[PDB]
Amino acid sequence: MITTKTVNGVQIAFDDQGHEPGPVFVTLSGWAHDLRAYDGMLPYLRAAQRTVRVCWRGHGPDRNLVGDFGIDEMAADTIGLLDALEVDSFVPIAHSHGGWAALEIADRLGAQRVPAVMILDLIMTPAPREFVAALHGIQDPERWKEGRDGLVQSWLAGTTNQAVLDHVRYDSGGHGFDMWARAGRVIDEAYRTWGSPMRRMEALAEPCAIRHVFSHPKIGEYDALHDDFAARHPWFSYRRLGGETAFPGIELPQQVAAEAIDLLAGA
Ligand SMILES: CCCCCCCc1nc2ccccc2c(O)c1O
C-alpha cells in the first residue's frame, strides 16, 4: 500500500487513492503517529475525492532519527509532496496539533489552492496550565514516558471504542524521546508564539473556510468560545460530536468524513 518520495531531503511516506474531480483530501496526523490515524475515515474520503494521506518526516516506515524540525518543515515537506504529484487545490484534514501545520500550509498557499481546512480536536484556547506541564514533562529525558501516559489517558477518557484503543495501544509504536520531546517543544512554542490556534487563524492574510470538529473538552464555555468565533468569522465553522475521545476521526469516522465532504461542498 504505502509509498515514499524524497522531498526537501527527507523521506515522506504517503498513499494516494481515488480519482474523482475537485479538490483533493490531504490527511495530516498529530505528532508521533502516522496515516493509520485515518484508516477508519479512508473508505469514506476516497469515495468522495482523491485522498492523499501524508506522514510527517521521521514518521513513516523509516524511523531513523532526522534532524530537528518544526511546523515550517511539516508544511514545506507536505507542500513539496503535493507539488511532486501536481495536486492543485486540496483540503487538509489535520488531527490535533497537526492543525498548526495545516494552517501554515493554508497561509502559504492562499485560499484558491487550499480553499478549506478541517481540524480535529485541537485545543482552541490558550494552553491550560495542566497541558503546559505535560508539554514540559515530555521534554524531560527521565519522565517523558510518564507525560505520554498522562496525555494518552486524557485523550481516551473511559472509552470502550476498540478502534481508538488499538490505535493508541498497538498502532503507534516506534517513537521515543526524540520525537515526543520535539512535539513538546514545537507545540509549547506555538502556543507561546500565537497564544492559541484561534489567534493563528485570525492572523491568516486571507482566511480560508476553517472547520473545527471535536468531542473532547466537555460541553460548556468551550462551545460558547466557538459560537463567538463563528459569529465574528463567517469563514470559521465547528461541530461538537458526541464521542468519548479526543480522536474523532478514529472514533466517529463516518461522521467526521461527512463533515469534511460538507465543508468542501460549501467552498
Ligand atoms: C499516541 C498516539 C499519537 C496521537 C497523538 C497525536 C495528537 C496529539 N499529540 C500530542 C503529542 C505530544 C503532546 C501533545 C499532543 C496532543 O495534545 C495531541 O492531541
From Swiss-Prot:
Enzyme class: oxidoreductase
Site (Increases basicity of active site His): residue numbering on this chain: D121
Record-level Gene Ontology MF annotations: dioxygenase activity
Pfam families documented for this protein: Abhydrolase_1 (PF00561)
Residues binding substrate: H97
EC number: 1.13.11.-
Catalytic activity: 2-heptyl-3-hydroxy-4(1H)-quinolone + O2 = N-octanoylanthranilate + CO + H(+)
Active site: A246
InterPro entries, alphabetized: AB_hydrolase_1, AB_hydrolase_fold
Upregulation: Up-regulated by PQS.
Keywords: Dioxygenase, Oxidoreductase
Record field: transmembrane: none
Oligomer status and interactors: Monomer.
Family as reported in the entry's similarity comment: Belongs to the AB hydrolase superfamily.
Role: Ring-cleaving dioxygenase involved in the degradation pathway of the Pseudomonas aeruginosa quorum sensing signal molecules HHQ (2-heptyl-4-quinolone) and PQS (2-heptyl-3-hydroxy-4(1H)-quinolone) to anthranilate. Catalyzes the cleavage of PQS to form N-octanoylanthranilate and carbon monoxide. Thus, leads to the inactivation of PQS that plays a central role in the regulation of virulence factor production by P.aeruginosa, thereby quenching the production of antimicrobials, which may contribute to the competitiveness of M.abscessus in presence of P.aeruginosa.
Name assigned to this protein: 2-heptyl-3-hydroxy-4(1H)-quinolone dioxygenase
Gene source species: Mycobacteroides abscessus (strain ATCC 19977 / DSM 44196 / CCUG 20993 / CIP 104536 / JCM 13569 / NCTC 13031 / TMC 1543 / L948) (Mycobacterium abscessus)
Lineage: Bacteria, Bacillati, Actinomycetota, Actinomycetes, Mycobacteriales
